[PDB]
Amino acid sequence: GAQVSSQKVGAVNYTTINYYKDSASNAASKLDFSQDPSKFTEPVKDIMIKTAPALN
Amino acid sequence: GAQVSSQKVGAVNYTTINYYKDSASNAASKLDFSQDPSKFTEPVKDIMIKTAPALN
Amino acid sequence: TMLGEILNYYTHWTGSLRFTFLFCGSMMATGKILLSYSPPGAKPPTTRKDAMLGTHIIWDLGLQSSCTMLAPWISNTVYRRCIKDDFTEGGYITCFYQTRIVVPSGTPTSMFMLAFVSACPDFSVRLLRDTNHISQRT
Amino acid sequence: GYSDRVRQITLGNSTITTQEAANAVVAYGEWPSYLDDKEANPIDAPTEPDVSSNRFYTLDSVQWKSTSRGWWWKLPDALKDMGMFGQNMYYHYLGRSGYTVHVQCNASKFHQGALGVFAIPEYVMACNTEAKTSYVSYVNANPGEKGGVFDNAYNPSAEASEGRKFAALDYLLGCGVLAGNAFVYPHQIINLRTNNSATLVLPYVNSLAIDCMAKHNNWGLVILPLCKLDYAPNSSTEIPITVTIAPMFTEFNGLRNITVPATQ
Amino acid sequence: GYSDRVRQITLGNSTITTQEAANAVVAYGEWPSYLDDKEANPIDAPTEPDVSSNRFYTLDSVQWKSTSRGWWWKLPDALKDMGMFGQNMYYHYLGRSGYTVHVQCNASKFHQGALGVFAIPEYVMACNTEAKTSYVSYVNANPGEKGGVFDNAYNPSAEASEGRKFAALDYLLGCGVLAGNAFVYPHQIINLRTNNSATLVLPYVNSLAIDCMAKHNNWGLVILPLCKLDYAPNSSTEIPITVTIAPMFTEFNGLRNITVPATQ
Amino acid sequence: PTAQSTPLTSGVNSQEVPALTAVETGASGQAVPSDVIETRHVVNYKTRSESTLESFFGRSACVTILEVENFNATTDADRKKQFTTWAITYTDTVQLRRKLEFFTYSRFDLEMTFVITERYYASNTGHARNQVYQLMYIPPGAPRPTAWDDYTWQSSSNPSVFYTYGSAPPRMSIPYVGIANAYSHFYDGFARVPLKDETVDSGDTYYGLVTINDFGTLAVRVVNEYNPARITSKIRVYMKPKHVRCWCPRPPRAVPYRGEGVDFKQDSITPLTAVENINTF
Amino acid sequence: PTAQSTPLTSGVNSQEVPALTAVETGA
Ligand SMILES: CC(=O)N[C@H]1[C@H]([C@H](O)[C@H](O)CO)O[C@@](O)(C(=O)O)C[C@@H]1O
Ligand SMILES: [Ca+2]
Ligand SMILES: [Ca+2]
Ligand SMILES: [Ca+2]
Ligand SMILES: [Ca+2]
Ligand SMILES: [Ca+2]
Ligand SMILES: [Cl-]
Ligand SMILES: [Cl-]
Ligand SMILES: [Cl-]
Ligand SMILES: [Cl-]
Ligand SMILES: [Cl-]
Ligand code: NA
Known part of the structure; x- marks a missing residue:
């Protein structure tokens, strides 16, 4: 049950096998590049178009 | 994700598996026999043919 | 600032910085204001005629309350250091009256604006480190 | 949402906003442009400095008072000491340029007054001695960013040497x-009850494709109070007028050592 | 008809001829070029002055004598006061440039001598005090077009303040x-019996795409007499060495007010 | 790929003259033996494997020796012996430095290895329990310790390695961390432009890479509290560049270094030993 | 996924005014 994944590039793959029956034992979660800044930077009810006036 | 490669001959293959998620952790780069001495030994604009006069 | 606090957990930063200004005078106050970013290596600007030679925006006060000036990413190195450092100096941000603030009678003649900073989507940080902003006795 | 009153202009590293504009003028309906091969004259490959020089330069502000008679500038004279535009201008024998002119003057809903803002091709002005004709010094004709002012009186000089100004x-x-x-x-008008800015986009105008910028101003910029500034709480109040101008589609020919004009 | 000895180079409004060349060097086999989008760093639209700045500038000549130990210049330092190149350099935080370097030294079929002409990336030189390390003043590091000379003796200063030079x-x-x-x-060699000029074409070389020209010289230019000048009728004769350099593919970012470096 | 084999050639009597050239061009001599002698065929099976950059640099080299101690310190000077800080560099030693300086620019990941040794300071003060060391990498900006047991050693974000005396030499990899697209081994410039008429000092400013380089600090302590027996330790730091690229070759250092710069020392600028005569075999 | 690339843009003279906003909105 080996997982082969891309490495973070340096100056290209690596292999992982989980040895333990509890997921808590696992190494770090894989890089998660998810983001949605707008839930904090623009949490407005009505859409604001940049090129338009903010208030009309 | 095992890589099998030729060994450097002695007086014929070996196996590598990367264990880490960062390429910086990897062992030495594979032998790179690339070369282009002419960028230092002959960096001239106009081609020089050995058998010809260097200056004509 | 929130950006500053996050930056102090990292060693390197890159990208554009957004400066947004909110005018908080009365509705009857008008004005034009110059906001400038001068990349480094020259006399720091202390007059409008030097400031206006750099990256700048002329903000007209009005119904739209806020104006955004960008410090676009303009750097020799690909990252700057999250410390005071001559080599990775970032330049100079200044602000001048372009005309002046004008008010009619019965109106406050002094007032304020608020300045905000945030990172743009081209912005990223590297090299996790401990901050100098928290400590304890031992 | 979009409005004749709200505008953004970006040239090079510079941006202007206004929230009380009145449309914008494109002089003679023609946007500036580069010089076409079929209308070209000097044959050397031109310098086209683009963003280094084609950007907004803000002149020293002037003060509008109830007694002001008006202001004038010439172009490219007013920008001759402006950053890389000035350098490109003076390192070359020949240059051409269009402009975006943005005149700025805000007040309040309780002030009144109206400024006429005019762009005048070949703005030739009268001299101030009646002992000679067309008798104006280079220095007085080319004041630079400070420009000049109008007067409501004509008082020509007693001696010709003292009247070599407009x-x-x-x-x-x-x-x-x-x-x-x-x-x-x-032209546009800045009528304080209506608008706080004027915007004029000017093509290159001349009887030639390209000319000597240090010898010849292509445009005059005139700001005249058509209706005087008035403000009831203080008739002696003054409000700034600020002039910001960007060269556009600049093109230069005949590179050599730098021109340094006489200063006195 | 065509020959390794005869060459014409034209950049902008300037042309060089030579009739006793020895080919030409393109450093590391790479012609200069503009900065590609996939290697770019500062995001403002760059100024690319082209013919105004990418042209041959001739430095003050130096005299080769039988006792000369050699000459050095740094680049872009040597060209910092050269026409529009200098102006573009100092009005911007960032700049990059390649170069055509043309070193000129003619004599006669009866003179002898050989000059090594070297283009050195990051030409860092030793300081002249042993009380400190890396202790060189900005002014002494950046002599401009006059460059500097080599010596055949090392005499470090008694006091640190007096040894802040190379x-x-x-x-x-x-x-x-x-x-x-x-x-x-x-490199090339100017060996008087063979040739009267050296030509080196240099790409931009740095660990960055673009950098601060006023802080950092990318190349050193070194001229060393490998074999001393000799002329039998007069061993004290001197012949000029003239250095002419054209920036190429110049590109500048981060426009603001002009940089004026310290002079003392 | 192998080094060049030699072809079978005889003699010539020809207008082709490969023996002559003109090095004024900037080209090195190019002729090979077959051009100027009669040669047999020799098949060359030998390779340049050990002179690739990876092979040339593929060694862990000692770059510094640090010292730390563990004892009951009652003075400021002795308190400062309980930990050490070192600005990370390759200029404390000469061997790796000289090899790197065949090149102007480089790009590589780093393997760092450490060798830690101890001795008893004295024999009349009993013994000492086995010691654990902390080696903390402090990137530029992170707070530096002023005592061996201050808050900085909690190292929430800085990488630290805890090493137990007698265990295998500790080791970690570091990526290429340069803020430029390569490391510069030489920098012909300054960190800022001094401007006309400014009041900033120009008499005590420096030049070159020292004005711009900063790879942070290594801080080392013994984690244990003091025993009656004072223990003194050395930490040898080793660097191996790996995954190496280099650009722009340079003549190698010919005379002794005297610091972090290219400066040379007046009593040590005569590397050649004079020969008796130009005709000395 | 990468941080944002910068597009090639020139200037404008337009009723589109992205430089102005109103942070009273909470944006
Ligand atoms: C570093 C060093 O030299 N240590 C030596 C000490 C100290 O000099 C004294 O104990 C200090 O007073 O003396 C010894 O005789 C000892 O204690 O057995 C030998 C030991 O090697
Ligand atoms: Ca908007
Ligand atoms: Ca030949
Ligand atoms: Ca151009
Ligand atoms: Ca043969
Ligand atoms: Ca301890
Ligand atoms: Cl002026
Ligand atoms: Cl100079
Ligand atoms: Cl702890
Ligand atoms: Cl303990
Ligand atoms: Cl001998
Ligand atoms: Na072979």
């Missing part, structure tokens, strides 16, 4: 024509 | 390596 008489537009007819030139 | 010791190439190995750098 007789900038307001109602004759400094040139023997009635100011009420200046509207035949590309 | 110890340009010829046989150690002013930097602790043997001069006989300078041929690992892009």
Whole structure:
């Protein structure tokens, strides 16, 4: 049950096998590049178009 | 994700598996026999043919 | 600032910085204001005629309350250091009256604006480190 | 959402906003452009400095008072000491340029007054001695960013040597024509109740494709108070007028050592 | 008809001819070029002055004597006061440039001598006090078009304040390596019996796409007499060496007010 | 790929003259033996494997020796012996430095290895329990310790390695961390432009890479509290560049270094030993 | 996924005014 994944590039793959029956034992979660800044930077009810006036 | 490669001959293959998620952790780069001495030994604009006069 | 606090957990930063200004005078106050970013290596600007030679925006006060000036990413190195450092100096941000603030009678003649900073989507940080902003006795 | 009153102009590293504009003028309906091969004259590959020089330069501000008679500048003269535009201008024998002119003057809903803002091709003005004709010094003709002012009186000099400046008489537009007819030139009006800025986009205008910028101003910029500034709580109040101008589609020929004009 | 000895180079409004060349060097086999989008860093639209700045500038000449130990310049330092190149350099925070370097030295069929002409990336030189390390003033590091000279003696200063200049010791190439190995750098030789000029075309070389020209010289230019000048009728004769350099593919970012470096 | 084999050639009598050239061009001599002698065929099976950059640099080299101690410190000077800080560099030693300085620019990941040794300071003060060491990498900006047991050693974000005396030499990899697209081994410039008429000091400013380089600090302590027996330790730091690229070759250092710069020393600028005569075999 | 690339843009003279906003909105 080996997982082969891309490495973070340096100056290209690596292999992982989980040895333990509890997921808590696992190494770090894989890089998660998810983001949605707008839930904090623009949490407005009505859409604001940049090129338009903010208030009309 | 095992890589099998030729060994450097002695007086014929070996196996590598990367264990880490960062390429910086990897062992030495594979032998790179690339070369282009002419960028230092002959960096001239106009081609020089050995058998010809260097200056004509 | 929130950006500053996050930056102090990292060693390197890159990208554009957004400066947004909110005018908080009365509705009857008008004005034009110059906001400038001068990349480094020259006399720091202390007059409008030097400031206006750099990256700048002329903000007209009005119904739209806020104006955004960008410090676009303009750097020799690909990252700057999250410390005071001559080599990775970032330049100079200044602000001048372009005309002046004008008010009619019965109106406050002094007032304020608020300045905000945030990172743009081209912005990223590297090299996790401990901050100098928290400590304890031992 | 979009409005004739709200505009953004970006050139190079510079941006202007206004929230109380009144449309914008494109002089003679023609946007500036580079010089086409079929209209070209000097044959050397031109320098086209683009963003280094084609950007907004803000001049020193002037003060509008109830007694002001008006202001004038010439172009490219007013920008001759402006950053890389000035350098490109003076390192070359020849240059051409269009402009975005943005005149700025805000007040309040309780102030009143109206400025005529005119762009005048070949703005030739009268001299101030009647002992000679066309008798104006280079230095007085080319004041740079400070420009000049109009007067409501004409007082020509007793001696010719003392009158080598413009007789900038307001109602004759400094040139023997009635100011009420200046509207035949590309213009806007800043009427304080309506707008706080004027924007004029100017193509290159000349009888030649390209010319000597240090010898010849292509445009005059005139700002005349058509209706005087008034403000009831203080009739002696002053409000700034700020002039910001960007060269556009600049093109230069005949590179050599730098031109350094006489200063006195 | 065509010959390795006869060459014309035209850049902008300037042309060089030579009738006794010896081919030309393109450093590291790479012609200069503009900065590609996939390698770019600062995001503002760059200024690319093209013909205004990418042209041959001739420095003050130096005199080769039988006793001369050699000459050095740094680049872009040597061209910092050269026409529009200098203006574009100092009005911007960032700049990059390649170069055509043309070194000129003619004599006669009866003179003899040989000059090594080397282009050295990051030509860091030793300081002249042993009380400190890396202790060189900005002014002494950046002499401009006059460049500097090598010496055959090393005499470090008694006090640190007096030794803030380069110890340009010829046989150690002013930097602790043997001069006989300078041929690992892009080079030509002007050997008077063979040729009267050297031509080196240099790409931009740095660990960055673009950098601060006023802080950092990318190349050193070194001219060392490998075999001394000799002329039988007059061993004290002198012949000029003239250095002419054209920036190429110049590109600048981060426009603001002009940089005026300290002069003392 | 192998080094060049030699072809079978005889003699010539020809207008082709490969023996002559003109090095004024900037080209090195190019002729090979077959051009100027009669040669047999020799098949060359030998390779340049050990002179690739990876092979040339493929060694862990000692770059510094640090010292730390563990004892009951009652003075400021002795308190400062309980930990050490070192600005990370390759200029404390000469061997790796000289090899790197064959090149102007480089790009590589780093393997760092450490060798830690101890001795008793004295024999009349009993013994000492086995010691654990902390080696903390402090990137530029992170707070530096002023005592061996201050808050900085909690190292929430800085990488630290805890090493137990007698265990295998500790080791970690570091990526290429340069803020430029390569490391510069030489920098012909300054960190800022001094401007006309400014009041900033120009008399005590420096030049070159020292004005711009900063790879942070290594801080080392013994984690244990003091025993009656004072223990003194050395930490040898080793660097191996790996995954190496280099650009722009340079003549190698010919005379002794005297610091972090390219400066040379007046009593040590005569590397050649004079020969008796130009005709000395 | 990468941080944002910068597009090639020139200037404008337009009723589109992205430089102005109103942070009273909470944006
Ligand atoms: C570093 C060093 O030299 N240590 C030596 C000490 C100290 O000199 C004294 O104990 C200090 O007073 O003396 C010894 O005789 C000892 O204690 O057995 C030998 C030991 O090697
Ligand atoms: Ca908007
Ligand atoms: Ca030949
Ligand atoms: Ca151009
Ligand atoms: Ca043969
Ligand atoms: Ca301890
Ligand atoms: Cl002026
Ligand atoms: Cl100079
Ligand atoms: Cl702890
Ligand atoms: Cl303990
Ligand atoms: Cl001998
Ligand atoms: Na072979």
